[PDB]
Amino acid sequence: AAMVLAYYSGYAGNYAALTRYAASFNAVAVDFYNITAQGAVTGNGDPAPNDAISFLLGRKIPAYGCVSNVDGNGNWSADIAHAVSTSAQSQAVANLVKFAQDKRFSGINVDFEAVAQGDRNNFSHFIQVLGRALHAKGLKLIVSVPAFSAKDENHPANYGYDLRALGAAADYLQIMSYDEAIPAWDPGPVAGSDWMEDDLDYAVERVPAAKILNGIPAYGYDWKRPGDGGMLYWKDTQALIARYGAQPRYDAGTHSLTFNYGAADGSRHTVWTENARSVALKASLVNAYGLGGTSLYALGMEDDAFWAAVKQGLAQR
Ligand SMILES: [Cl-]
């Protein structure tokens, strides 16, 4: 009975995908909300997703309010995470609980990114208190965390996340096992299976596996050159291959698809993305590790073959 958590966020085609694929996922993170440094939950600038929430209630699909520490400029804010975890903790915890109640959410997904390394224990404590408060009301807690293994656990980007502590408090950790490479960096696998398995080994040693969700992207990246690239949605991969007549290579060691092409401006692009084999493989890791399930980022980027591959992999024993 694996959880199959879809992300409903600010992307074109989101609602069409939510409704088209509602037999494929069985929980949704409704990524429409921010929290302030005073602990108040707000909208994120996009229209309130009240239609999506109503749809999910009618389908009996659990919905989680996904709340981010994003400031008024649209930037991840270490300061907001610090404040919520310390001075505004009591307000934030109560407000998150009431927010879930008000919206008829089944729980909260805390998506706090750029947590400062100095806030490791503060953030763990916030999640402990929040988990107890949600549980006291029959609600659940999912915490989204960056994906890493021991070699990088002390990196400034990762040390704020104590998986052992977070996993003991939350119902699930949503391990963001994607963005292994990003446009700002050198080209490479975005969700390589070797890296993912290292990350999952690290997580399940520290957290009961049934409380872990892995993460599978419905996208890859297209680099013009290192540091210069853009997102390529799953649904657009085949058209791009066809536009340039590219011959894609399956990298078996990382279960990732790559290809190159020469653009009209003379640059040689490099794409790393997924195919059906790689998505099924990454979903099959739920059974290989005894995970609680998987998470897919995000609705609106995909087509029917993406969800067919997720289904196939989840059924692989
Ligand atoms: Cl980037």
PDB file of all heavy atoms in Angstrom, residues 48-66:
ATOM      1  N   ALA A  48      -5.517  30.751  -4.911  1.00  0.00           N
ATOM      2  CA  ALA A  48      -5.774  29.679  -3.967  1.00  0.00           C
ATOM      3  C   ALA A  48      -6.306  28.451  -4.698  1.00  0.00           C
ATOM      4  O   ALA A  48      -7.231  28.575  -5.518  1.00  0.00           O
ATOM      5  CB  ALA A  48      -6.791  30.133  -2.923  1.00  0.00           C
ATOM      6  N   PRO A  49      -5.779  27.256  -4.417  1.00  0.00           N
ATOM      7  CA  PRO A  49      -6.136  26.047  -5.162  1.00  0.00           C
ATOM      8  C   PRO A  49      -7.388  25.365  -4.596  1.00  0.00           C
ATOM      9  O   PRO A  49      -7.411  24.156  -4.340  1.00  0.00           O
ATOM     10  CB  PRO A  49      -4.872  25.198  -5.020  1.00  0.00           C
ATOM     11  CG  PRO A  49      -4.411  25.529  -3.643  1.00  0.00           C
ATOM     12  CD  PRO A  49      -4.660  27.008  -3.490  1.00  0.00           C
ATOM     13  N   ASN A  50      -8.446  26.143  -4.382  1.00  0.00           N
ATOM     14  CA  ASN A  50      -9.606  25.595  -3.688  1.00  0.00           C
ATOM     15  C   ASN A  50     -10.337  24.557  -4.533  1.00  0.00           C
ATOM     16  O   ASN A  50     -10.910  23.604  -3.990  1.00  0.00           O
ATOM     17  CB  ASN A  50     -10.501  26.730  -3.217  1.00  0.00           C
ATOM     18  CG  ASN A  50      -9.773  27.649  -2.223  1.00  0.00           C
ATOM     19  OD1 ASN A  50      -8.971  27.164  -1.408  1.00  0.00           O
ATOM     20  ND2 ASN A  50     -10.002  28.956  -2.319  1.00  0.00           N
ATOM     21  N   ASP A  51     -10.265  24.705  -5.851  1.00  0.00           N
ATOM     22  CA  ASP A  51     -10.810  23.726  -6.780  1.00  0.00           C
ATOM     23  C   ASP A  51     -10.084  22.387  -6.680  1.00  0.00           C
ATOM     24  O   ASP A  51     -10.713  21.320  -6.698  1.00  0.00           O
ATOM     25  CB  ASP A  51     -10.722  24.300  -8.210  1.00  0.00           C
ATOM     26  CG  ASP A  51      -9.316  24.877  -8.598  1.00  0.00           C
ATOM     27  OD1 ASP A  51      -8.372  24.878  -7.796  1.00  0.00           O
ATOM     28  OD2 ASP A  51      -9.197  25.350  -9.747  1.00  0.00           O
ATOM     29  N   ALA A  52      -8.755  22.425  -6.614  1.00  0.00           N
ATOM     30  CA  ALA A  52      -7.962  21.213  -6.483  1.00  0.00           C
ATOM     31  C   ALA A  52      -8.260  20.502  -5.170  1.00  0.00           C
ATOM     32  O   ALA A  52      -8.400  19.261  -5.125  1.00  0.00           O
ATOM     33  CB  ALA A  52      -6.476  21.554  -6.593  1.00  0.00           C
ATOM     34  N   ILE A  53      -8.353  21.270  -4.089  1.00  0.00           N
ATOM     35  CA  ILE A  53      -8.635  20.677  -2.794  1.00  0.00           C
ATOM     36  C   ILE A  53      -9.996  19.983  -2.824  1.00  0.00           C
ATOM     37  O   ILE A  53     -10.145  18.842  -2.368  1.00  0.00           O
ATOM     38  CB  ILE A  53      -8.531  21.739  -1.683  1.00  0.00           C
ATOM     39  CG1 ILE A  53      -7.091  22.257  -1.547  1.00  0.00           C
ATOM     40  CG2 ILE A  53      -9.041  21.192  -0.357  1.00  0.00           C
ATOM     41  CD1 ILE A  53      -6.960  23.504  -0.710  1.00  0.00           C
ATOM     42  N   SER A  54     -11.002  20.650  -3.392  1.00  0.00           N
ATOM     43  CA  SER A  54     -12.331  20.068  -3.484  1.00  0.00           C
ATOM     44  C   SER A  54     -12.337  18.784  -4.300  1.00  0.00           C
ATOM     45  O   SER A  54     -13.027  17.820  -3.949  1.00  0.00           O
ATOM     46  CB  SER A  54     -13.257  21.110  -4.103  1.00  0.00           C
ATOM     47  OG  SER A  54     -14.494  20.551  -4.405  1.00  0.00           O
ATOM     48  N   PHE A  55     -11.608  18.775  -5.411  1.00  0.00           N
ATOM     49  CA  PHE A  55     -11.514  17.576  -6.226  1.00  0.00           C
ATOM     50  C   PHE A  55     -10.969  16.408  -5.418  1.00  0.00           C
ATOM     51  O   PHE A  55     -11.500  15.290  -5.464  1.00  0.00           O
ATOM     52  CB  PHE A  55     -10.628  17.871  -7.447  1.00  0.00           C
ATOM     53  CG  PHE A  55     -10.322  16.652  -8.257  1.00  0.00           C
ATOM     54  CD1 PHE A  55     -11.281  16.093  -9.095  1.00  0.00           C
ATOM     55  CD2 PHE A  55      -9.089  16.034  -8.165  1.00  0.00           C
ATOM     56  CE1 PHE A  55     -11.013  14.937  -9.819  1.00  0.00           C
ATOM     57  CE2 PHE A  55      -8.809  14.898  -8.907  1.00  0.00           C
ATOM     58  CZ  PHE A  55      -9.778  14.345  -9.729  1.00  0.00           C
ATOM     59  N   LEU A  56      -9.876  16.649  -4.700  1.00  0.00           N
ATOM     60  CA  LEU A  56      -9.229  15.595  -3.931  1.00  0.00           C
ATOM     61  C   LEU A  56     -10.114  15.103  -2.793  1.00  0.00           C
ATOM     62  O   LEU A  56     -10.178  13.897  -2.542  1.00  0.00           O
ATOM     63  CB  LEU A  56      -7.863  16.067  -3.442  1.00  0.00           C
ATOM     64  CG  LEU A  56      -6.878  16.377  -4.570  1.00  0.00           C
ATOM     65  CD1 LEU A  56      -5.667  17.111  -4.025  1.00  0.00           C
ATOM     66  CD2 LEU A  56      -6.450  15.109  -5.326  1.00  0.00           C
ATOM     67  N   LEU A  57     -10.810  16.009  -2.109  1.00  0.00           N
ATOM     68  CA  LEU A  57     -11.746  15.587  -1.080  1.00  0.00           C
ATOM     69  C   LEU A  57     -12.798  14.662  -1.668  1.00  0.00           C
ATOM     70  O   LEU A  57     -13.141  13.634  -1.072  1.00  0.00           O
ATOM     71  CB  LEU A  57     -12.395  16.813  -0.441  1.00  0.00           C
ATOM     72  CG  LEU A  57     -11.496  17.618   0.503  1.00  0.00           C
ATOM     73  CD1 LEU A  57     -12.087  18.981   0.814  1.00  0.00           C
ATOM     74  CD2 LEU A  57     -11.181  16.856   1.786  1.00  0.00           C
ATOM     75  N   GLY A  58     -13.334  15.017  -2.840  1.00  0.00           N
ATOM     76  CA  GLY A  58     -14.362  14.183  -3.449  1.00  0.00           C
ATOM     77  C   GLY A  58     -13.862  12.816  -3.872  1.00  0.00           C
ATOM     78  O   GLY A  58     -14.633  11.857  -3.925  1.00  0.00           O
ATOM     79  N   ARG A  59     -12.581  12.710  -4.185  1.00  0.00           N
ATOM     80  CA  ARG A  59     -11.953  11.457  -4.593  1.00  0.00           C
ATOM     81  C   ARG A  59     -11.381  10.685  -3.405  1.00  0.00           C
ATOM     82  O   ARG A  59     -10.824   9.592  -3.581  1.00  0.00           O
ATOM     83  CB  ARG A  59     -10.830  11.719  -5.615  1.00  0.00           C
ATOM     84  CG  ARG A  59     -11.295  12.164  -6.985  1.00  0.00           C
ATOM     85  CD  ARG A  59     -12.105  11.072  -7.657  1.00  0.00           C
ATOM     86  NE  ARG A  59     -12.572  11.504  -8.972  1.00  0.00           N
ATOM     87  CZ  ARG A  59     -11.896  11.339 -10.102  1.00  0.00           C
ATOM     88  NH1 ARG A  59     -10.733  10.716 -10.109  1.00  0.00           N
ATOM     89  NH2 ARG A  59     -12.390  11.808 -11.231  1.00  0.00           N
ATOM     90  N   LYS A  60     -11.505  11.244  -2.196  1.00  0.00           N
ATOM     91  CA  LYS A  60     -10.929  10.662  -0.970  1.00  0.00           C
ATOM     92  C   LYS A  60      -9.409  10.468  -1.038  1.00  0.00           C
ATOM     93  O   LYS A  60      -8.859   9.537  -0.459  1.00  0.00           O
ATOM     94  CB  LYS A  60     -11.629   9.348  -0.582  1.00  0.00           C
ATOM     95  CG  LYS A  60     -13.128   9.518  -0.423  1.00  0.00           C
ATOM     96  CD  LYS A  60     -13.872   8.198  -0.387  1.00  0.00           C
ATOM     97  CE  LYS A  60     -13.663   7.476   0.912  1.00  0.00           C
ATOM     98  NZ  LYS A  60     -14.803   6.541   1.143  1.00  0.00           N
ATOM     99  N   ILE A  61      -8.738  11.383  -1.735  1.00  0.00           N
ATOM    100  CA  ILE A  61      -7.285  11.358  -1.875  1.00  0.00           C
ATOM    101  C   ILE A  61      -6.686  12.332  -0.866  1.00  0.00           C
ATOM    102  O   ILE A  61      -6.948  13.543  -0.969  1.00  0.00           O
ATOM    103  CB  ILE A  61      -6.847  11.736  -3.297  1.00  0.00           C
ATOM    104  CG1 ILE A  61      -7.321  10.672  -4.298  1.00  0.00           C
ATOM    105  CG2 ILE A  61      -5.344  11.902  -3.390  1.00  0.00           C
ATOM    106  CD1 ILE A  61      -7.173  11.090  -5.743  1.00  0.00           C
ATOM    107  N   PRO A  62      -5.913  11.848   0.105  1.00  0.00           N
ATOM    108  CA  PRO A  62      -5.336  12.757   1.105  1.00  0.00           C
ATOM    109  C   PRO A  62      -4.556  13.900   0.466  1.00  0.00           C
ATOM    110  O   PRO A  62      -3.727  13.708  -0.433  1.00  0.00           O
ATOM    111  CB  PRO A  62      -4.415  11.840   1.921  1.00  0.00           C
ATOM    112  CG  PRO A  62      -5.065  10.478   1.812  1.00  0.00           C
ATOM    113  CD  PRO A  62      -5.589  10.443   0.398  1.00  0.00           C
ATOM    114  N   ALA A  63      -4.807  15.100   0.977  1.00  0.00           N
ATOM    115  CA  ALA A  63      -4.133  16.309   0.536  1.00  0.00           C
ATOM    116  C   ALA A  63      -3.331  16.874   1.691  1.00  0.00           C
ATOM    117  O   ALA A  63      -3.836  16.994   2.809  1.00  0.00           O
ATOM    118  CB  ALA A  63      -5.128  17.343   0.028  1.00  0.00           C
ATOM    119  N   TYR A  64      -2.096  17.264   1.402  1.00  0.00           N
ATOM    120  CA  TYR A  64      -1.189  17.860   2.375  1.00  0.00           C
ATOM    121  C   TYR A  64      -0.944  19.311   1.995  1.00  0.00           C
ATOM    122  O   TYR A  64      -0.633  19.611   0.842  1.00  0.00           O
ATOM    123  CB  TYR A  64       0.144  17.097   2.430  1.00  0.00           C
ATOM    124  CG  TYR A  64       0.046  15.752   3.094  1.00  0.00           C
ATOM    125  CD1 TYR A  64      -0.561  14.682   2.470  1.00  0.00           C
ATOM    126  CD2 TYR A  64       0.539  15.552   4.360  1.00  0.00           C
ATOM    127  CE1 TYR A  64      -0.669  13.444   3.108  1.00  0.00           C
ATOM    128  CE2 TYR A  64       0.443  14.346   4.998  1.00  0.00           C
ATOM    129  CZ  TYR A  64      -0.178  13.299   4.384  1.00  0.00           C
ATOM    130  OH  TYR A  64      -0.243  12.109   5.056  1.00  0.00           O
ATOM    131  N   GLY A  65      -1.047  20.211   2.961  1.00  0.00           N
ATOM    132  CA  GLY A  65      -0.697  21.593   2.710  1.00  0.00           C
ATOM    133  C   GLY A  65       0.808  21.730   2.707  1.00  0.00           C
ATOM    134  O   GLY A  65       1.436  21.488   3.737  1.00  0.00           O
ATOM    135  N   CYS A  66       1.393  22.058   1.552  1.00  0.00           N
ATOM    136  CA  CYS A  66       2.847  22.158   1.404  1.00  0.00           C
ATOM    137  C   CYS A  66       3.251  23.616   1.576  1.00  0.00           C
ATOM    138  O   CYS A  66       2.870  24.477   0.773  1.00  0.00           O
ATOM    139  CB  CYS A  66       3.288  21.561   0.070  1.00  0.00           C
ATOM    140  SG  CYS A  66       5.049  21.752  -0.297  1.00  0.00           S
TER     141      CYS A  66
END
